[PDB]
Each structure stands twice: as structure tokens, then as C-alpha cells.
Amino acid sequence: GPQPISRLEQCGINANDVKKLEEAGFHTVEAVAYAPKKELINIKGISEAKADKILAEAAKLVPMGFTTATEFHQRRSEIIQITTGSKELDKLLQGGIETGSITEMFGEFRTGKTQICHTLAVTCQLPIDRGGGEGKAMYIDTEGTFRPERLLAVAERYGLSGSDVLDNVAYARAFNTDHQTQLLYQASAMMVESRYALLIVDSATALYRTDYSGRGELSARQMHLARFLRMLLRLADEFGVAVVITNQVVAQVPKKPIGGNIIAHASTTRLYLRKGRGETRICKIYDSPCLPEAEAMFAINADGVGDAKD
Amino acid sequence: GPQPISRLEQCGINANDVKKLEEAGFHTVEAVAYAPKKELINIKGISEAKADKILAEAAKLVPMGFTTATEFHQRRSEIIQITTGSKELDKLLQGGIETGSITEMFGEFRTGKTQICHTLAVTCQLPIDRGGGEGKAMYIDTEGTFRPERLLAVAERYGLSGSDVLDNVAYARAFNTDHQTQLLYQASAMMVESRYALLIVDSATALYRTDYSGRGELSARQMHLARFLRMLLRLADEFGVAVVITNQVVAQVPKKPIGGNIIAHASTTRLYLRKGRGETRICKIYDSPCLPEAEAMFAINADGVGDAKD
Amino acid sequence: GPQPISRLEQCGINANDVKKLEEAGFHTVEAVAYAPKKELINIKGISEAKADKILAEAAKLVPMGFTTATEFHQRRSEIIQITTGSKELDKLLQGGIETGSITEMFGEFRTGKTQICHTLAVTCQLPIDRGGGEGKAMYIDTEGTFRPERLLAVAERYGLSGSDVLDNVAYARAFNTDHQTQLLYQASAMMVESRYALLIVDSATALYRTDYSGRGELSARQMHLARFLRMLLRLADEFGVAVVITNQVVAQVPKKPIGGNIIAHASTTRLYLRKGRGETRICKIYDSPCLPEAEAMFAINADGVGDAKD
Ligand SMILES: Nc1ncnc2c1ncn2[C@@H]1O[C@H](COP(=O)(O)OP(=O)(O)OP(=O)(O)O)[C@@H](O)[C@H]1O
Ligand SMILES: Nc1ncnc2c1ncn2[C@@H]1O[C@H](COP(=O)(O)OP(=O)(O)OP(=O)(O)O)[C@@H](O)[C@H]1O
Ligand SMILES: Nc1ncnc2c1ncn2[C@@H]1O[C@H](COP(=O)(O)OP(=O)(O)OP(=O)(O)O)[C@@H](O)[C@H]1O
Ligand SMILES: [Ca+2]
Ligand SMILES: [Ca+2]
Ligand SMILES: [Ca+2]
Ligand SMILES: [Ca+2]
Ligand SMILES: [Ca+2]
Ligand SMILES: [Ca+2]
Ligand SMILES: [Ca+2]
């Protein structure tokens, strides 16, 4: 996995600058490697020569050069894909949700954008042979709609200890945009000690629609949103985890996702959800760089997300 | 093609200054010919007399004088044009994408700005008689949206060995502006050994919107962007390759490309992409010094970019 | 026209100093007459007495005294004006572009600042009775956007041999500021043998925005720009040709031309270009010592610049 920043000590760097970088939010050598010189210079206790020697030492451990696409293809052959509990949903995703990208699911209310996250938070702990990811699950909430009862219900479905499921899930509720951005630093800190395999944000844009209610604040809020998305992308690239976010929909004068072009460009795989009939739902791939546009049917049962049991 | 800097040895120059220039990033005699005296003086181990004698010797091999436009027209008669796989798209471009300039394609998300690059990366390896370029393809990524599966799918369309396609493509993912600029030096180094025919950057402005988020950093970031564009122009002029870049779009208070006047002036051919109906797309020439404004229709099929199969 | 420097031999000057002046860039007696003593002294093989006798002999052939403004008015009655192909554009310019001054056209991208030069390069070869200038055209390029196809298209419009048009046009592409200044010496050399009637630079400031990227280099680059502008002014005064340059625009925190006060003061007639609707464009006189501020409409057709065919 990720090399702890403790190694940077034996490269010829004193232990003082190591913790000076620690307070800045960096905890791994890869995290420091990907950061340009500007943020390192921004840190109060680092000179230009210090930043240059740090970057030079860090670049040795992490390769940053050109490679043949055959090696990249072989590396992509071992991406871990998490199953969603529904065979038709998994066939649409060609196996499941990839680890190392941003996946966004949006749609009308009552379409169960939260039950997907609830089911994933538990199916991600399954062994790899069964389609899981063998790791803890991290949940960030902004609506207060987190219910452990669904977690227990879907844990009993796969035959797992209910107590051991509620012990590998970290929960924290945000209250504003600032706290939402601040929680990512603590997430990066805790991802180094243990191993995580899924990051869930619900909802990524439920706060930005209200805090910046003024007219002239649109350009002021989309910049902050871009910073948040880049932080999530850095976390995905560093620890190699899967990030899933939920987005609201705003009707247009038939439904258009809210967030502007920033979230559309940043996101790689986007799923459109609309209600079917009864408890059935319809999932359609809205945007993806490798999958074609299609539709799938799934139902919300008492044991989490399952196939359309008619 | 380009004359290796090894020849500059027999002009009356010692082998020490040759590698001193090599560390600076110069690898061909043409590259040294186009560089003014200021950068040569900037190099630590070169005196003013050394720079003057180097420029005087280099100017002999590379012509730098006035010529009749008839010779230039005859030279332009042999520009290599790469086909895009769609006949209607090729008719709009009057044959294909020229080699020796900067081509920029931009538009809303999901409009397939990346599938064009994926198709070009493979069609550029076709024999010239079939519309290819007979050369390797170089891919620089900033979004992590590189998928070899599309490359294999579009390679099987033209009847080519899938393994031999993924072996003539160099892939490298950038993480910040500094790394994006630094990768060009390695690209220039590797263009001398083998032969390349296409340079792809995706995306050229996906990083600059976030790194320089401060208000007073606009003039600080557009200068760096101008340096990057001039480096790309120098690469295009030196090795005679084709450079294609992808640009995001920002809505205006109906879509305006992001990048400012610098990218607009630097770019020669600009393509505007918007979604048609279903899997069809609409391509419109936005800016070009020789082609008139028009529209074309193409569709994204399972075998890459193809004609509108209705 | 201009008296060759060969005459200076029969004034009492040996043939050695004549070619010593030739290597310095002087080729006509008028060119030597306008140069102060400082540059002549700067030449290695000339003494103070030599420079004084050269200036004294040269001043006899070229008048340098006061004259009545009636003679100047009668001389101005025979200025050659080149038509731009559009009647509304010509009415704005009161006949066309004068010969013996610097004309600058600037504006947003895609406004066709290069198509004006392409059309002029061909309309300048027309007979005087038809509004031409009866002379060759000289083109200096810095963007690589020179296309002979537009030249042929606009040559067929006026009924001229396509081959004979591409044979009276000299093309040369600059790569840095130093080469841009150096090409003027060769232009001055070749203007003596044949007859030229138009000098085109595109773009005059496309290189200076990047080469001198440092903060403290602003005063270092504007001096060089002033030298370049004075060289162009000397060429215009000596051979009596028309000089046209193209300038980029930089947005201000609605568009401001780039170049500073030097280019504004040096230029005499400045044209502001902005896009109309469709293929139409709007031309506005920005600065001129004799024409009032007004607006005109023209369109970019398939046969070069023409009137607004609605
Ligand atoms: N225990 C349960 N058993 C069966 N169906 C349930 C259960 N709990 C909730 N549901 C159903 O799931 C749906 C609610 O899902 P959810 O709250 O995730 O929707 P949502 O669209 O993501 O919500 P919002 O956007 O309002 O936060 C409703 O149709 C509800 O009837
Ligand atoms: N294998 C495939 N077969 C058919 N269509 C596909 C396939 N893979 C992706 N698509 C379609 O191509 C489009 C996605 O293209 P692409 O990712 O290049 O878009 P983009 O606008 O360049 O993206 P962005 O700006 O978000 O990076 C979608 O319409 C998607 O349905
Ligand atoms: N053959 C043609 N027929 C008709 N219109 C054309 C033709 N070639 C180019 N155009 C149009 O002319 C315009 C491009 O002109 P041009 O390249 O001179 O612009 P510019 O503003 O000077 O460019 P830049 O500053 O980017 O160098 C575009 O509107 C393009 O559609
Ligand atoms: Ca609700
Ligand atoms: Ca919810
Ligand atoms: Ca996307
Ligand atoms: Ca993409
Ligand atoms: Ca352009
Ligand atoms: Ca141009
Ligand atoms: Ca003026």
C-alpha cells in the first residue's frame, strides 16, 4: 500500500520537517510526491531549498515517468470491483464498482440513493472471492439519514456477525461546507493506520445549495466545490480506494443534476436512477468512459438491495 | 527527420558542452537553432562566446531565411493527415487532422472528448495508404480515464494485432502543473530515439482550474499556461508531429471554453462538440485559418468513433 | 526609388568602406543619410573623420531642410492606397491603406486578423488603376498560420494567374525575438534588388509575451520592442512601403490591446476588430491622426474578404 512518511527520515531529512509536513495534512510519501512546490512553500517552516530537496528525495521512491500501455493494462487487470448485491446491476457495471475513481448516483427522491450506500458499506467487507473488498467502510453523512438497522438487516443476509459489521464502519455527520472539507484531513490520517476500501459521501451537494444563497456567490462556491472534488481525487489516487457520492436533482423548465459542469467533468461514472413500478427501480448509466448506455432493473427489499423478485 | 545533436560535435565543438546542452533539454540541432541566446546564457556552464559560436554553427545546418511561397505550397502538399474513422468527420476536416499544429476539441461532458483521442491513438498507426501516420502514439493523461479496452475494440475494427497496438503507446498520468510541464522534457528525449506521430494531452486545463484557486494568481497561472503552450508548439515544429488537446467548458451567465485568450490565440484549429440525439453527436468547427464554419454528425459505436449508423 | 549605395563611390569614397557599410546593414544612400554618427562610429573599421566625410557627402544627395507645406500637400496627393476588397471597409479608410506608415489591427480571436493580411498580400499586386500597388508582397509569420490556398482562392476572384501570385510572395517564419529582428536585415537587402509594396508581420507581439516571462524583464523587453518598431519605421520611410502588423488582445479585470504604450505611440492608424453575427465582422477605427471614429461591416467569404452579402 502507501509508504509511511516515516521513511522520508532515512533519506537525509531531519525529524523536525517530517512532523512539520504532518501538521500540513501529508502522511504518506506518495501524498508528498504528488504535491507541487507551491503548497510546500506555503508551509511556514520550509525554505525553497528544503522543498526542492524534499521533492527530489520523494521522486526517487515513487515512479513518475512514461510506461507502456501493456503494463497499465496488466495493472488494470487486478482492479478490485465491489458487488452491489444485484446480479442485473452488476452485469450493467461489468462486475461492480471500480476502486480508484469517483462514482456518482443521482435521481429523484425516494429512489433509494442512500440504500445503495448502505448496502455497499456492508458488501465491501466480504472476502474478495465472494465479490467484496476485504476492508473497512467509511461513511460521511450530511442529511442525518444514517440507520444501522439496514446495515444489520443486510449483514444477516450474507451471514455475518452483526456486531463485527458495526465495528468496521466510521460515521461522522457534517454541518457545513467547512466541516465537510475538514473531515477529509482526518480521513486521510486514519486511512494510514488501518485499511479502508470504500468512501461514501451523502450528500456531496446538499450543503452548497443553501450556504451560498447569494447571487454573486456562485463563482465563490464552485471554486470551493472544485477544491473538495480534487481532495477526493487525491484520496482515491493515493490509497487506491473507491469513492461514491450522491447528488440531488433539480427540475428544469425532465430532471437535471445539480452541481454544474465541475461535478460532471470531475466524475467518471455517473448513474441515473428513476423509480420503476412498486418497489422496483430503474438504473441507467448516464456517463462512463468505458461502458455503453443501458438500463437495469432492481428492487429495494427488506434485506437491502436485491434483484427484482416478482 | 531531426538531426541528432551528436553532429554538433564535428562542427568544432567539444563533447563537454554537448552534454551540458543535453541536460538542459536540447537533443536535436533544430531545437538548439530555434532557441534564442537568453536560454543558452542561462545555462551555468556556457559563456557568451560559447553561445555565439554554438548559434553560428547551428544556423548553418538549418535554413532560417526567406523563401518563395511556391516552395512552401509544395511542402504543404505532403502534410500527413490522420483520419478520424468517420467519413463525415473527415470531409469536415478536408481529409483529417494535420501534423504540425495544435488542435483543440472542447464541449459539454459526455460528448466523448476522450473517445476521439482513443480512436486517434490507434488509427495513427495505420499505413499512410489507409490514412494513418505510420508511427507510435503518445498519451498524457490528467483525469485517470485511460482505458485500453477501447483501444483493443477499435484495433479489432481495422484488423490489427491487439498486442502490437498496446506496445506502441506510451502512457503517463500527471498529478499537478509542475509534473505536466516536466513530462514534456522526457517526451522530447524519447521522440529522438523512436518515431512518434501523435501527442495527446487530456486534459490541458483540468489542473489549472484548481491549483491556482486564489484571486491574485490568475496572472500567475496564465503565464505558466503560455509557457506550456509554447513548449507544445516547439515540439510540434521540431519533430513534425500532431498535437491534440482537450478543454473543459464553463457555463456563462451558452457554453464558453475555459482557458482565456491565451489558449484561443495559441490554438489554430478548434472544434466544438455538442450531443446530438441518442448516441449521435454534432461536431462544429469553431476556429480554423483555412476551413469554413460547418457542422457534421458522428456517433459513438462499440468499435470506437464511427459514422451515424441509423 | 532609393539610390543604391554604389553611387557613394563616386563621391570621393573608396570601395572598401562601401562594403564595410554594407556588412552593417546599410544598402542605400538614404539609409546612411538618416543614421546618426553614433552607429557609424560603432562600426569597427570607420574613424571619426571617415564618418564625418560620409555624412557630409551623403547629405548632399538627400534633402534635409525646411519646406513649405504646400509641396508636402502636393506630395501627399500621390500616396498609393491599397484597397482591402470591401467597399465599406475602403470608405472607412477613405480609399485604402496608406503607404509610408504603420497600420495595426487587433481584436479577439477568430475575428480574422490573418485573412485581412492574406487578402492584402494579393490585392497589392493589382494595377494601380484597379486600386493595387503594382509590387511584390512580403510576409513574415510567427504563428505558422500561412495558407497559400486562401491566396489562390482570392487570386481567382480578381482573375489572376495562380502561379504568378505565389511567385511574388516571400515567406519566412520566425522562431524567437532575435530571429524576428534579424529577418529585417535580409528584408532590407532584398528590397533593393526588386520592388516591394507591402510588409506584413503576424504577429508582432506573439513572441514577446513568452520569451520575457520574468518580472524584472518588462523594461528589458519593451526596449527591444522599441528597437523593432524603429527598424520598421526606418524601412517604411526608406523604401516607401506599407507596413501592417497584427496584435493580440488581453482581457482586463472589455478588451485591451497588448504591447504597452510603446506600440500605441509608435502606431499611427489602429483598427479594432470584433465579431458581428454569423460570418459578418465589425471594424472600428481605434486611433488615427486624420480619420474620425466610425464603424464598418464586412464578411469573410470563401473568396477572401468581401462585402456583407446577406
Ligand atoms: N426497511 C425497509 N424495507 C423496505 N423498503 C424500505 C425500507 N426502508 C426504506 N424503504 C424504502 O426505500 C425508499 C427510501 O430510500 P432512501 O431514503 O434511500 O431514498 P432517497 O431517494 O435516497 O432519499 P432522499 O433523497 O430523500 O435522501 C422508500 O421507497 C422506502 O419505502
Ligand atoms: N464501450 C462503449 N460503447 C459505447 N458507448 C460508450 C462506451 N464507453 C463509453 N461510451 C459512451 O461514451 C460517452 C462517454 O465518453 P467520454 O468519457 O469520452 O466523454 P467526455 O465528454 O470526454 O468526458 P469527460 O469530460 O467527463 O471526461 C458516454 O455517452 C458513454 O455512454
Ligand atoms: N476558407 C474559408 N472560408 C470561409 N471562412 C473561413 C475560411 N477559412 C477560415 N474561415 C473563417 O475565418 C475565421 C478564422 O480567421 P483567422 O484565422 O484569420 O482569425 P484570427 O482571429 O486572425 O486568428 P488567431 O488570432 O487565432 O490567429 C473563422 O471564423 C473561420 O471560420
Ligand atoms: Ca426524503
Ligand atoms: Ca438520503
Ligand atoms: Ca465524466
Ligand atoms: Ca475524459
Ligand atoms: Ca486560433
Ligand atoms: Ca493568425
Ligand atoms: Ca498613434
From Swiss-Prot, chains A, B, C:
Modified residues (Phosphotyrosine): 34
GO CC annotation, single: nucleus
Primary location class: nucleus
Effect of residue 44 to R: Impaired ubiquitination
Covalent cross-link Glycyl lysine isopeptide (Lys-Gly) (interchain with G-Cter in ubiquitin) as placed by the record, residue numbers: 38, 44
Listed SMART domains: AAA (SM00382)
List of residues that carry Phosphothreonine: 280
Domain notes: The nuclear localization may reside in the C-terminus (between 259 and 339 AA).
Annotated family: Belongs to the RecA family. RAD51 subfamily.
Protein name, entry field: DNA repair protein RAD51 homolog 1
Source organism of the structure: Homo sapiens (Human)
